[PDB]
Design a protein around this nucleic acid. Structure first.
Ligand SMILES: [Mg+2]
Ligand SMILES: [Mg+2]
Ligand SMILES: [Mg+2]
Ligand SMILES: [Mg+2]
Ligand SMILES: [Mg+2]
Ligand SMILES: [Mg+2]
Ligand SMILES: [Mg+2]
Ligand SMILES: [Mg+2]
Ligand SMILES: [Mg+2]
Ligand SMILES: [Mg+2]
Ligand SMILES: [Mg+2]
Ligand SMILES: [Mg+2]
Ligand SMILES: [Mg+2]
Ligand SMILES: [Mg+2]
Ligand SMILES: [Mg+2]
Ligand SMILES: [Mg+2]
Ligand SMILES: [Mg+2]
Ligand SMILES: [Mg+2]
Ligand SMILES: [Mg+2]
Ligand SMILES: [Mg+2]
Ligand SMILES: [Mg+2]
Ligand SMILES: [Mg+2]
Ligand SMILES: [Mg+2]
Ligand SMILES: [Mg+2]
Ligand SMILES: [Mg+2]
Ligand SMILES: [Mg+2]
Ligand SMILES: [Mg+2]
Ligand SMILES: [Mg+2]
Ligand SMILES: [Mg+2]
Ligand SMILES: [Mg+2]
Ligand SMILES: [Mg+2]
Ligand SMILES: [Mg+2]
Ligand SMILES: [Mg+2]
Ligand SMILES: [Mg+2]
Ligand SMILES: [Mg+2]
Ligand SMILES: [Mg+2]
Ligand SMILES: [Mg+2]
Ligand SMILES: [Mg+2]
Ligand SMILES: [Mg+2]
Ligand SMILES: [Mg+2]
Ligand SMILES: [Mg+2]
Ligand SMILES: [Mg+2]
Ligand SMILES: [Mg+2]
Ligand SMILES: [Mg+2]
Ligand SMILES: [Mg+2]
Lengths: 126, 136, 64, 25, 84, 99, 215
RNA sequence: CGCAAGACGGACCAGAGCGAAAGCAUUUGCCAAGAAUGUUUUCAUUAAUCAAGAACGAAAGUCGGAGGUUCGAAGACGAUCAGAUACCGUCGUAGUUCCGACCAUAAACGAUGCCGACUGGCGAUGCGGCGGCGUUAUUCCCAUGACCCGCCGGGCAGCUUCCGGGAAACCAAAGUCUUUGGGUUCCGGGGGGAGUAUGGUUGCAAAGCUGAAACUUAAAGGAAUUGACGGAAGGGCACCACC
């Protein structure tokens, strides 16, 4: 048997999805026609294997993103999550409080407010 | 082969002494004191080729031959004292050890407290073999 | 020196041991007390689930 | 060994020769 | 070590961590102190690393003890460093 | 050429160490150059433990362990696959193999 | 001895244990019945039985094997007496481990009776709960002081006692329990036992003193 | 179950310790010795390395006594093999052990003289001292011990790197070297003949120390690279391989 697609079958199927993503549905016999229209595959046997990897990749891409294919419609949802996140309109705030040996680090840099104190358990970690 | 005058609930105890060298294995069995002895079977009685005298099958053939004889008298439960060769030697039990021990739990007896006993020296004499060892 | 036959059912196939890889390691039940279990070495082509026949259930073979 | 045994053979021949010489005189 | 440390003016707190022979001028780690026992009252002055059993010139059977290093006092009160 | 920084031995700051006999070869190797192995195993086998725990006279019995300390000559320790020859730079790992 | 069926000439016996122990029935022995001159009661003495502790108190640990010799027979009853304790092997072998210090001592002593004992002790330094150094080693003088204390305690607790009172201390091991608390201001010493006792010399019989124990 | 004998001190036991090196492990006592550490003690150049000379020196071996458990050169057999005077097996003399005299060698190795100066980082580890929050033990104490966090000496080592060096493997010394000189002792000069011959000397002996030449030869050698091979290891494969 074998059935380990060669790198010339796993590179067509990767370019095709990038260029034509909105045609390539999820069944095999329609993809076998779209692929025959868009590119020039000089054989029937090769055309079918390319169109058969396209379907695998399509089923996988209807989940999370795959690391060889950069499609337009799935960039923008990452671009969003980098532009901002649903969590906060405030900063994670300046109103935060700390403990000793830093009050004296500031006493030589001149701060005077919004802090706390607790002298830690009296020997190094255990 | 009479025994004690009680047989109903309690268990008349005994002691095994499984000696399990390479080359051969003995299943003894004695009374609770150790002094007086009962049937003793050794792997080389059960098989007829020297190379087999220590093997799991020769040991399983001996454990039963001792269990049937003990059950014939009074002894229902057994204590176990497991022996390797010891004395500046292998001090790890041979191939019959595990095999004879399971073969009398299965053939009727009841196992008591099991212990390891093998002579271990506090720096013994010089071991046979030569300074360059027994090379193969 | 007299033991009845026992019938075991194969529950799992482990690997193909032996020097030419001829015999097969297998784990069996016992069909009267399904609690028991041993590892045996068979000679033909075992599948899974079929009833072997043991002439001495006490052994337990451990290699080739 | 071959250095060890060369040394040993030379030693035994030297013993034989010394014995012959000093027994001659 | 920064490749530019200046040696003519060491740290007033590092100059005291190095061995007594290895600092710019040698200087002992010992000192003198005025012990003052309870009871009989005299101001006998003792070396630190004493290595002798000293006595108070009066009502004491002992006043300090020898050890591997600094002497350990029994009950000596003041023991001020004498600072000359 | 030199093959090990420590000569394949533990001795540093010492003249002599008392020898010790191999456990199968009966050879005679230094106590720091021999290959040691502690072995802790049940007196019963793991196949048998469910049968022996079934015909005890007592209700709770945890079976005894067998403590043995073994020493191997190098030839016998290599013939019994206790250790294997390693790559040249992969020779300088001291941590014992992962369990 | 291969005359016909040498097991149809044996008689079974009982074996009792001194009145300190709860389960007072050790088990059974057997012996060729009285013949021309080798009277059986001769053959039933000097038999040593090694008995785990759990088969005596029913409530204590499974190590601490005791030993009991028989001294006289009274109509199918073998009456026995103390002979010396030991410890089972694997407990011992499983205490001895690396990065420690095994301290050992031993003494010879008498009871108020002529019973001359020969005791043995053993202890192990402790890794303190909060430690980080991989080793818990003791210096040599600390070891020596610990040994002095271990010999001294272990001799006091026997010299002032009859055989029965010392066996009563051996049963729960108050001896090692005390030493573990005494030697704690030198090195914590997390494990202390009395690993063996040998009986060296024993005084005259005195049947009545025996029956004191079995009363 | 008990008696006797001789040797051996396991597990703890470590890239730990001590000693000038060879070497050194059951408890307790006696005898002198020592490094490191602490010091606002004392003398004031007393030092470093060393021909001559001198102490110790594993195992084997020699001589005279005592002893003789295990192991075992030589030896007698049984196997294995073409043969087996060998590897393997049973037995066994000298020996192995102690006392008194000899012997002076070893891959006696870190294959690396000793003394002194300077040049990176990091953690640990054995000894001593100093500082410090807790925890723990005894009399509730303080003193002291076990632990935890640092610092200072000198010790056995380890990791790390383009300090630098080297033919390279590699080395914090085997560095500070054509930019060559801190002090001093032993010792090498292509390969063999050869640590042989001979003379001297020491030894009861076995042997040690000192030690040539004739003649013969174009290489012998060191570190590293690529193959080929292995009765070396880990994966995988083929009815011209097996089952
Ligand atoms: Mg070989
Ligand atoms: Mg090589
Ligand atoms: Mg040293
Ligand atoms: Mg050195
Ligand atoms: Mg040496
Ligand atoms: Mg002795
Ligand atoms: Mg020991
Ligand atoms: Mg030490
Ligand atoms: Mg000289
Ligand atoms: Mg010698
Ligand atoms: Mg000798
Ligand atoms: Mg002489
Ligand atoms: Mg003799
Ligand atoms: Mg011969
Ligand atoms: Mg041949
Ligand atoms: Mg022959
Ligand atoms: Mg031989
Ligand atoms: Mg022999
Ligand atoms: Mg000599
Ligand atoms: Mg001399
Ligand atoms: Mg030499
Ligand atoms: Mg040399
Ligand atoms: Mg230097
Ligand atoms: Mg310290
Ligand atoms: Mg240090
Ligand atoms: Mg470079
Ligand atoms: Mg460095
Ligand atoms: Mg350095
Ligand atoms: Mg270093
Ligand atoms: Mg240099
Ligand atoms: Mg230079
Ligand atoms: Mg210089
Ligand atoms: Mg030359
Ligand atoms: Mg030639
Ligand atoms: Mg030459
Ligand atoms: Mg020369
Ligand atoms: Mg001469
Ligand atoms: Mg001369
Ligand atoms: Mg002469
Ligand atoms: Mg010369
Ligand atoms: Mg080469
Ligand atoms: Mg392989
Ligand atoms: Mg195939
Ligand atoms: Mg063919
Ligand atoms: Mg075929």
């Amino acid at each position: 048997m074998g059935r380990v697609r060669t790198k010339t079958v796993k590179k067509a199927a990767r370019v095709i999805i990038e260029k034509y993503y909105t045609r390539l549905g999820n069944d095999f016999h329609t993809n076998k026609r779209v692929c025959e229209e868009i590119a020039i595959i000089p054989s029937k046997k090769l055309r079918n294997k390319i169109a058969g990897y396209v379907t695998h990749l399509m089923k996988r891409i209807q989940r999370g993103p795959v690391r060889g294919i950069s499609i337009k419609l799935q960039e923008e949802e990452r671009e969003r999550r980098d532009n901002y996140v649903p969590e906060v309109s405030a900063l994670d705030q300046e109103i935060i409080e700390v403990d000793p040996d830093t009050k004296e680090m500031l006493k030589l840099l001149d701060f005077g407010s919004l802090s706390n104190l607790q002298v830690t358990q009296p020997t190094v970690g255990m | 082969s009479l025994g004690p005058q009680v047989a109903e609930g309690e268990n008349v105890f005994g002691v095994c002494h499984i000696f399990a060298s390479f080359n051969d294995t003995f299943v003894h069995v004695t009374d609770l004191s150790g002094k007086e002895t009962i049937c003793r079977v050794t792997g080389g009685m059960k098989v007829k080729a020297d190379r087999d005298e220590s093997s799991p099958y020769a040991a399983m053939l001996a454990a039963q031959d001792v269990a049937q004889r003990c059950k014939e008298l009074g002894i229902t439960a057994l204590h176990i004292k497991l022996r390797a060769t010891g004395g500046n030697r292998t001090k790890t039990p041979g191939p019959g050890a595990q095999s004879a021990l399971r073969a009398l739990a299965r053939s009727g007896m009841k196992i008591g407290r099991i212990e390891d006993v093998t002579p271990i020296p506090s720096d013994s004499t010089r071991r046979k073999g030569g300074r360059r060892g027994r090379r193969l | 020196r007299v033991q009845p036959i026992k019938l075991a059912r194969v529950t799992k196939v482990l690997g193909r041991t032996g020097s030419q890889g001829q015999c097969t390691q297998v784990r069996v039940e016992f069909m009267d007390d399904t609690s028991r279990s041993i590892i045996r070495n068979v000679k033909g082509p075992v599948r899974e689930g079929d009833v072997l026949t043991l002439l001495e259930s006490e052994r337990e073979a451990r290699r080739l | 060994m071959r250095a060890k045994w060369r040394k040993k053979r030379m030693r035994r021949l030297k013993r034989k020769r010394r014995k012959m010489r000093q027994r001659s005189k | 070590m920064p490749l530019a440390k200046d040696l003519l003016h060491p740290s007033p707190e590092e100059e005291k961590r190095k061995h007594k022979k290895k600092r710019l001028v040698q200087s002992p780690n010992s000192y003198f102190m005025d012990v003052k026992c309870p009871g009989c009252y005299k101001i006998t002055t003792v070396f630190s690393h004493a290595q002798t059993v000293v006595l108070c010139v009066g009502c004491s059977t002992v006043l300090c003890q020898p050890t591997g290093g600094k002497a350990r006092l029994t009950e000596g009160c003041s023991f001020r460093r004498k600072q000359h | 050429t030199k093959k090990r920084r420590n000569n394949g031995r533990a001795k540093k700051g010492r003249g002599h160490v008392q020898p010790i006999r191999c456990t199968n070869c009966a050879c005679c190797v230094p106590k720091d150059k021999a290959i040691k192995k502690f072995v802790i195993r049940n007196i019963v086998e793991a196949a048998a433990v469910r049968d022996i725990s079934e015909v005890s006279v007592f209700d709770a019995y945890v079976l005894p362990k067998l403590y043995v300390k073994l020493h191997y000559c190098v030839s016998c320790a290599i013939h019994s696959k206790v250790v294997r020859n390693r790559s040249r730079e992969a020779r300088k790992d001291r941590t014992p193999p992962p369990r | 001895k291969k005359v016909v069926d040498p097991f149809s000439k044996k008689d079974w016996y009982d074996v009792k244990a001194p009145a300190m122990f709860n389960i007072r029935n050790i088990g059974k022995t057997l012996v060729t019945r009285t013949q021309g001159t080798k009277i059986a009661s001769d053959g039933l003495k000097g038999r040593v039985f090694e008995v785990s502790l759990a088969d005596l108190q029913n409530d204590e640990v499974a190590f601490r094997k005791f030993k009991l010799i028989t001294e006289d027979v009274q109509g199918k009853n073998c009456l026995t007496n103390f002979h010396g304790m030991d410890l089972t092997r694997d407990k011992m072998c499983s205490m001895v481990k690396k990065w420690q210090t095994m301290i050992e001592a031993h003494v010879d002593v008498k009871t108020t009776d002529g019973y001359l004992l020969h005791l043995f002790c053993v202890g192990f330094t402790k890794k303190c709960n909060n430690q980080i150094r991989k080793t818990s080693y003791a210096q040599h003088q600390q070891v020596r002081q610990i040994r002095k204390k271990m010999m001294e305690i272990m001799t006091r607790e026997v010299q002032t006692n009859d055989l029965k009172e010392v066996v009563n201390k051996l049963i729960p091991d108050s001896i090692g329990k005390d030493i573990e608390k005494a030697c704690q201001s030198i090195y914590p010493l997390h494990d202390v036992f009395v690993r063996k006792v040998k009986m060296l010399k024993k005084p005259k019989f005195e049947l009545g003193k025996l029956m004191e124990l079995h009363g």
